[PDB]
Amino acid sequence: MKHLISMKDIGKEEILEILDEARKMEELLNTKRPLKLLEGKILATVFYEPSTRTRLSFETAMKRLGGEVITMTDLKSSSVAKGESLIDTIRVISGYADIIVLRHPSEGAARLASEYSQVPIINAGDGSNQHPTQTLLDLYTIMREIGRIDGIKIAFVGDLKYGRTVHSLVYALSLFENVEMYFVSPKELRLPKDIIEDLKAKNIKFYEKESLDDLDDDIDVLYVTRIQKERFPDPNEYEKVKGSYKIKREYVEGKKFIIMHPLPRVDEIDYDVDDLPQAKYFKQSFYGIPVRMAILKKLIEDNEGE
Amino acid sequence: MKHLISMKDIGKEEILEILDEARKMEELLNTKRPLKLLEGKILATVFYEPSTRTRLSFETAMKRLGGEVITMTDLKSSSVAKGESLIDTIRVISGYADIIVLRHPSEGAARLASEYSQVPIINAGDGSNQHPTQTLLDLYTIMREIGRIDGIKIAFVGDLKYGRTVHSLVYALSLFENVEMYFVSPKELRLPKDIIEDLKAKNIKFYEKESLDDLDDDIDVLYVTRIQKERFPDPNEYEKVKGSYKIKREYVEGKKFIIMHPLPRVDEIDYDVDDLPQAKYFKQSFYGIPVRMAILKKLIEDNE
Amino acid sequence: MKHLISMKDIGKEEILEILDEARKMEELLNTKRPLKLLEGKILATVFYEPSTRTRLSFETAMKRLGGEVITMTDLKSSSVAKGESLIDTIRVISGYADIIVLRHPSEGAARLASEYSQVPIINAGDGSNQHPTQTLLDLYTIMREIGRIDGIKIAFVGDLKYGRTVHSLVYALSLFENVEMYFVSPKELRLPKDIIEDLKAKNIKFYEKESLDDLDDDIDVLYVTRIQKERFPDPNEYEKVKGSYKIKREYVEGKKFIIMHPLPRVDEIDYDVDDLPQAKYFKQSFYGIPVRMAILKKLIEDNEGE
């Protein structure tokens, strides 16, 4: 693997390979003794559309492996860009660092950048459409907390029509055996038609539900996604929707499932749910470090341009 | 010690312990040898209200001990948070790093953060409630330059009514034996009533003075604090106040005291005072590194 | 050498010494294996007027030598400065780090800073009088790609009246033996009168040309500089000028020269020129790392507890 642009370029086999490397990295974090696997390496954080969350995650991961990091964000402003094209920037940075994590608005972006980069490119998503590293850490969370990915019952709650990370995860999961999916969402924000078709094409047991009460205590994972205002300009409307899908304490208690959420959470989950056993979104947050360490390591080794 | 939230959680004992560790750190620096005391460690700089000064200080300190640093500033915006609560952020960062230096506006902030952090939290002031690390380095400066903290005569000049770092230092000093305090300031910015009460309660010889000339050459330390235009909207007014408390060269020359100033200084001290022997504010600036190295080291070790 | 403020403080001898050290650094980079030459050192990036490019360059260089870096950009905004003078800041940072790369608007700036710094100061240009490190890497590019600096034919294209990096390079080159210079530019943006005088005073064969076709293929280096809008408020005019000096394919193919450009390039050079053999601007970009490593190393050693 010379780049990590899209989950659709990876198969269940490579996914597992990565999840394994991730577990190794997690254990290494427990040795607690200074790691130097990527000692003489430099990671370049090239963000056009800022994301302190994603940067810090990758930055931490790189440093945990003993590597160095140079950052270049807010490339969008003319002060941090200066009319220079992505292509020129990728070529210059490509010459400075050993690996690049890119975040660009345009669609080709990542893919294109990889074409001009003499270095591996990790796509931190083109804003949306494709964030591999996120999906991978999601899978790792399930693998880690549920003990397996195959044959699990997962339920997604929230904007499923525009939830990119949800789409990406639904696709990845569709590569595993017997995954039962539940899509809880407002009538308007249902899972894209074409996506459902792919699920059908892969003979995947799935159900579209309109209420959280439709779900049973047999779901293993409850993946909560945000529902932004832009979908319901009318406050009244938005109000009803928030209340209808908000994960409350009384609903969580005793449930078998674990609660995941890519963060940041704002309204999707009550704060009194945090201290409940099934709340796992912050653990999920942590898992991003080990899998990102896994990815950085792999990408660099796989392309030993020594 | 698992956190450093307020000076009021530390006693003279622990203070001295810290000042000692600080000295060690200072010496380790002077030798000029790559240090690796905090080698595999990561410090997280979580600033909601930006402060390049404080960040750089702690960043340098952490790196001098061979540690790594991840920074996250200006959270107070839809350019980094997007509506995520301090509590959620602390929990996420807490899982990434090994130690966190927080800077937040809200009062509980630091303390609260420490409750949700699975990692030590160093309070870089909840805006202007308590800035431990600063007071500690101030103490270190006195200890270092005067040779002792106990029984010294210190004079504070400037906005004493709102000078947070001054209040914090006055409290810490009140924990030492026989410290004589002088509060030089405009009739408008005198030291808070309740603070004076605490000083009285601790039987501390102190005097409020209106002029810099009301002092005698028996002062060991002259701690200069800033006085902002926001206190005297009227330029005329402000103008006269600036002149009245500005530390000038012909006032300094020959004086026993050392001049301290938490920085940045703008009007409080003339530039011709800089090269005078008693000017110690830049040295004080430096001392921040060793004491912060001391604090980072301790907090991490203490929490094995 | 205790500071690097201006190219006019360096002689051909020292220049070559630096270019040599630079080569060493370049080869050290090829030696894929962690360098620790500046292990316990800390570089401070003090930029009042931001420049993500220069910062990243120096940051990379410092980290490649195994050093650490603390950054402090745009103290220009009353947010990062607070009314504190450059002198006070230099003194404080001077006490924190081991070496400082300054970028300030005012003229004295760098020089002045060096007076109050208890640490070496590398001038990243007052943005209008001297950027040593850039000129040095330019020289290194010629030295490395052409094989020599002495007796070469170099042609500068673009705003030569305000091109600071061009002026700095023209001066440095004037210290070498038999360098033939060509100044291709619009009648308005001709090389400053006083500069031409210095060239005359040093008996330097030079020609001022108005067209790129005025150049014969006996040229070794074509240094392309930008021509910003502010020089031709009238779009018509500007468009006119852009087309007249734009380096196109049809013009480059088969030419003996190598093309240099300090970057970022916007209009000055067509993208189809990039993959042509004589295109060397991105290589030039890279060379900044080795020479900056060279400079950082030297400045720190030259001042090792003197």
Q: What DSSP assignment string belongs to A164-212?
A: HHHHHHHHHHTTSTT-EEEEE--STT---HHHHHHHHHTT--EEEESSG
DSSP character for A12? Answer: H
Spatial CB neighbours of A163, under 8 Å, sequence gap ≥ 6: A156, A225, A226
What value, to the nearest 5°, has the Cα angle with vertex C50 and ends C133 and B79?
145
CB contact under 8 A, A97 and C60: yes
Q: Which of A70, A84, A306 sits opposite C60 (nearest CB)?
A: A70
**Residues of C in Cβ contact (< 8 Å) with B285:** 91-92, 95
Distance of alpha carbon B13 from alpha carbon B31, whole angstroms: 28
Which of helix, strand or coil describes residue B114? Answer: helix
CB contact under 8 A, B95 and A285: yes
Count, residues in chain B: 304
Residues A52 and A174 in one domain: no
Distance of alpha carbon B1 from alpha carbon A302, whole angstroms: 45
Which is it for the CA torsion A128, A132, A137, A140, positive or negative? positive
Distance of alpha carbon A176 from alpha carbon B115, whole angstroms: 40
CB C260 within 8 A of CB C280: yes
Give helix then strand counts, H and E, for chain C: 10, 9
The CATH number linked to B30 is: 3.40.50.1370
Residues C77 and C177 in one domain: no
SS (H, E, C) A16-31: HHHHHHHHHHHHHHHH
Method: X-ray
* DSSP bridge partners of A269: A247
Residues A186 and A279 in one domain: yes
Distance of alpha carbon A281 from alpha carbon C79, whole angstroms: 35
CB C191 within 8 A of CB C170: yes
Min Cα distance C188 → chain B (Å) is 43
CB C172 within 8 A of CB C131: no
CB B75 within 8 A of CB B47: yes
Min Cα distance A201 → chain B (Å) is 37
CB contact under 8 A, A96 and C60: yes
Sheet holding B68-72, edge to edge: B68-72, B42-47, B99-103, B121-123
Would you state the structure tokens that stand for residue A13, as one six-digit string? 């086999």
**Residues of A in Cβ contact (< 8 Å) with C64:** 42
Spatial CB neighbours of B70, under 8 Å, sequence gap ≥ 6: A56, A59, A60, A63, B42, B43, B44, B45, B96, B97
Distance of alpha carbon B53 from alpha carbon A29, whole angstroms: 32
Report in angstroms the alpha-carbon separations of A29 from A24, A26, A67, C34: 9, 5, 15, 22
Q: What's chain A's Rg over C-alpha atoms?
A: 20
CB contact under 8 A, A84 and C264: yes
Residues B41 and B185 in one domain: no
Give helix then strand counts, H and E, for chain A: 11, 9
Q: Which residue does chain A place closest to B72, by CA atoms?
A: A52
Q: Which of C32, C56, C266 sits opposite A96 (nearest CB)?
A: C56
Residues B124 and B135 in one domain: no
Binding site feature residues of A for L-aspartate: 82, 164, 226
Which is it for the CA torsion C124, C129, C132, C133, positive or negative? positive
Report in angstroms the alpha-carbon separations of A155 from A166, A181, A187: 11, 6, 16
Residue tagged 């996914």 (tokens): A15
CB C136 within 8 A of CB C142: no
Q: Whole domain around residue C41: which residue ranges? A: 1-130+288-306
Q: Are strands C206-209 and A68-72 parallel, antiparallel or unpaired?
A: unpaired
Q: By C-alpha distance, which of A179, A110, A113 is closest to A151? A: A179
* DSSP bridge partners of A181: A154, A206
Residue C24 CA, chain-centre distance (Å), reads 20
Which chains form contacts with chain A, at 3 or more CB pairs under 8 Å? B, C
CB C131 within 8 A of CB C164: yes
User: Resolution for this model in angstroms, one decimal place?
Assistant: 3.0
What value, to the nearest 5°, has the Cα angle with vertex C116 and ends C115 and C119?
90
Residue tagged 């209808």 (tokens): A244
Distance of alpha carbon B158 from alpha carbon B260, whole angstroms: 12
Residue type, A117: S
CB contact under 8 A, C286 and A95: yes
Distance of alpha carbon A247 from alpha carbon A237, whole angstroms: 18
Query: How many CA within 13 A on the CB side of residue A260?
Result: 30
Spatial CB neighbours of B212, under 8 Å, sequence gap ≥ 6: B157, B184, B244, B245, B247, B251
CB B192 within 8 A of CB B164: no
Residue tagged 């009285």 (tokens): B200
CB C107 within 8 A of CB C130: no
Give which of B38, B42, B96, B115 to mutate to test A binding, by max A Cβ within 10 Å.
B96
Which of helix, strand or coil describes residue C258? Answer: strand
Give helix then strand counts, H and E, for chain B: 10, 9
Backbone angles phi, psi at C292, to 5 degrees: -75, -35
CB A157 within 8 A of CB A182: no
Min Cα distance A286 → chain B (Å) is 6
**Gapped junctions in chain B, after residues (C–N > 2.5 Å):** none
Distance of alpha carbon B30 from alpha carbon A44, whole angstroms: 33
**Residues of B in Cβ contact (< 8 Å) with A271:** 85, 87
Which is it for the CA torsion A93, A98, A101, A104, positive or negative? positive
Report in angstroms the alpha-carbon separations of B62 from A25, A41, B45, B292, C260: 24, 21, 11, 8, 41
Residue tagged 């007027």 (tokens): C49
Q: Which of C79, C83, C95 sits opposite B266 (nearest CB)?
A: C83
Backbone angles phi, psi at B25, to 5 degrees: -60, -45
* DSSP bridge partners of A247: A269
Spatial CB neighbours of A132, under 8 Å, sequence gap ≥ 6: A4, A5, A6, A7, A10, A122, A123, A168
Query: How would DSSP label each residue in B137-195?
Result: HHHHHHHHHHS-SSS-EEEEES-TTT-HHHHHHHHHHTTSTT-EEEEE--TTS---HHH
Would you state the structure tokens that stand for residue C194, as one six-digit string? 């006083």
* DSSP bridge partners of A42: A68
Residue A127: CB atoms within 10 Å = 17
Q: Which of C33, C50, C264 sits opposite A88 (nearest CB)?
A: C264
CB C242 within 8 A of CB C176: no
B294: part of which helix (H) or strand (E)?
A: helix B281-302
Binding site feature residues of C: 53-54, 82, 103, 131, 134, 164, 226, 263-264
CB A104 within 8 A of CB A113: yes
Distance of alpha carbon B136 from alpha carbon B128, whole angstroms: 16
CB contact under 8 A, C70 and B59: yes
Distance of alpha carbon C191 from alpha carbon C184, whole angstroms: 9
The conformational region for residue A262 under phi > 0 = left, psi -120 to 50 = alpha, else beta, is alpha
Torsion of CA A60, A64, A70, A75, to 10 degrees: -20
Backbone angles phi, psi at A49, to 5 degrees: -100, 110
Spatial CB neighbours of B243, under 8 Å, sequence gap ≥ 6: none
DSSP character for B83? Answer: S
Residues A56 and A159 in one domain: no
Report in angstroms the alpha-carbon separations of B108 from A224, A258, B111: 29, 31, 6
SS (H, E, C) C90-133: HHHHHHHCCEEEEECCCCCHHHHHHHHCCCCEEECCCCCCCCHH
Report in angstroms the alpha-carbon separations of B272 from B242, B268, C22: 16, 12, 42
**Residues of C in Cβ contact (< 8 Å) with B271:** 87
Which is it for the CA torsion B72, B76, B80, B83, positive or negative? positive
Torsion of CA B265, B271, B272, B278, to 10 degrees: 30
DSSP character for C266? Answer: S
Distance of alpha carbon C305 from alpha carbon A130, whole angstroms: 52
Distance of alpha carbon C212 from alpha carbon C246, whole angstroms: 9
Residues C126 and C203 in one domain: no
Give which of B65, B91, B94 to mutate to test A binding, by max A Cβ within 10 Å.
B91
Exposed/middle/buried for A60, CB within 10 Å: 0-12, 13-18, 19+? buried
Residues A160-174: b if buried by 16+ CB within 10 A, e if exposed: bbbbbbbbbbbbbbb
Residues A283 and A142 in one domain: yes
C143: part of which helix (H) or strand (E)?
A: helix C132-146
* Binding-site residues on chain C for chain B (CB distance < 8 A): 39-40, 42, 68, 70, 72, 75, 79-84, 87-88, 91-93, 95-97, 305
Residues C2 and C32 in one domain: yes
Residue A256 CA, chain-centre distance (Å), reads 23
Residues A139 and A23 in one domain: no
Which is it for the CA torsion C289, C143, C179, C188, positive or negative? negative
Which of helix, strand or coil describes residue B293? Answer: helix
Q: Which residue does chain A place closest to B36, by CA atoms?
A: A34
CB A102 within 8 A of CB A55: no
Distance of alpha carbon B293 from alpha carbon B59, whole angstroms: 10
Would you state the structure tokens that stand for residue C58, as one six-digit string? 């120096």
Q: Are strands C68-73 and C42-47 parallel, antiparallel or unpaired?
A: parallel
Give which of B48, B56, B68, B74 to mutate to test C binding, by max C Cβ within 10 Å.
B56
CB contact under 8 A, C52 and A92: no
* Binding-site residues on chain A for chain B (CB distance < 8 A): 32-35, 50, 52-53, 56-57, 59-60, 63-64, 263-266, 271, 282, 285-286, 289
Would you state the structure tokens that stand for residue C89, as one six-digit string? 């800041």
**Residues of B in Cβ contact (< 8 Å) with A32:** 40
Distance of alpha carbon A112 from alpha carbon A116, whole angstroms: 7
Torsion of CA B142, B144, B149, B151, to 10 degrees: -90
CB C284 within 8 A of CB C134: no
* DSSP bridge partners of A224: A157
Would you state the structure tokens that stand for residue A4, as one six-digit string? 């990590």
Residues A115 and A248 in one domain: no
**Residues of B in Cβ contact (< 8 Å) with C65:** none
CB contact under 8 A, A50 and B80: yes
DSSP character for A98? Answer: S
Report in angstroms the alpha-carbon separations of C197 from B250, C175, C204: 51, 15, 10
Helix axes C109-116, C86-96, angle to 10 degrees: 50
Q: Which of C82, C91, C96 sits opposite B56 (nearest CB)?
A: C96
Task: Quickly list H helices, C174-306.
Answer: 193-201, 235-245, 249-252, 281-302
Binding site feature residues of A: 53-54, 82, 103, 131, 134, 164, 226, 263-264
Report in angstroms the alpha-carbon separations of A140 from A30, A260, B106: 17, 12, 36
**With DSSP H G I counted as helix, E B as strand and the rest as coil, what are the percentages for chain A, rounded to 5?**
45, 15, 40
Residue B59 CA, chain-centre distance (Å), reads 16
CB contact under 8 A, A35 and B39: no
Residues C190 and C275 in one domain: yes
- Total tally of structural domains belonging to chain C: 2
Which of helix, strand or coil describes residue A126? Answer: strand
Report in angstroms the alpha-carbon separations of B110 from A47, B48, B106, B280: 30, 12, 9, 30
Residue type, A60: T
Distance of alpha carbon B124 from alpha carbon B134, whole angstroms: 8
